Design a protein around this ligand. Structure first.
Ligand code: BZV
Ligand code: GLP
Length: 133
């Protein structure tokens, strides 16, 4: 069931995002702006198709996908990756693969907040999102 993830979510806490971005090769000026933005994430479904928007004053993205079906994605930092999103232990797990590299974007609901854990290399970033009414 993906339904408790659906809605509009606002960033309210971030840990180690600079380490994560630097692990991906994001340049210092982009990391600087991204360390101060607070994106809004919108997760919607229509039948079997999920759409995940990320909006901010700096970068915007949007992806649509079916759980368990690979899709091409061009990330906010301009990586061209092979992606798949699935539910695993009630967590929404997004795996990106490119050039033999991987990164995971794992979303979990804890006490009504959405916790996004971003892992690449040894870098582990935890970002916390609050639901907007
Ligand atoms: C798809 C997310 C980016 C669009 C809004 C991003 C503002 C900064 C936060 C998100 C990505 C950062 C943009 C700068 C390049 C780093 C991007 C690394 C992959 C995107 C991570 C998204 C993290 C977030 O959804 O909280
Ligand atoms: N098609 C691409 C996206 O795949 C890429 O992620 C994005 C970069 O982020 P932004 O749109 O904020 O420049 O540019 C375009 O929209």
């Amino acid at each position: 069931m993906v339904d408790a993830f659906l809605g509009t979510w606002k960033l309210v806490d971030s840990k180690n995002f600079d380490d994560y971005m630097k692990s991906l090769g994001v340049g210092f000026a982009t990391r600087q702006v991204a360390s101060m933005t607070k994106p809004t994430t919108i997760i919607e479904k229509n039948g079997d198709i999920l759409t995940l928007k990320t909006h901010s004053t700096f970068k915007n993205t949007e992806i649509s996908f079916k759980l368990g079906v690979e899709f091409d994605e061009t990330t906010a930092d301009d990586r061209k990756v092979k992606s798949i999103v699935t539910l695993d232990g009630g967590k929404l797990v997004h795996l990106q693969k490119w050039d033999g590299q991987e990164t995971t974007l794992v979303r979990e609901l804890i006490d009504g907040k959405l916790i996004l854990t971003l892992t690449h290399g040894t870098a582990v970033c935890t970002r916390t999102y609050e639901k907007e009414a």
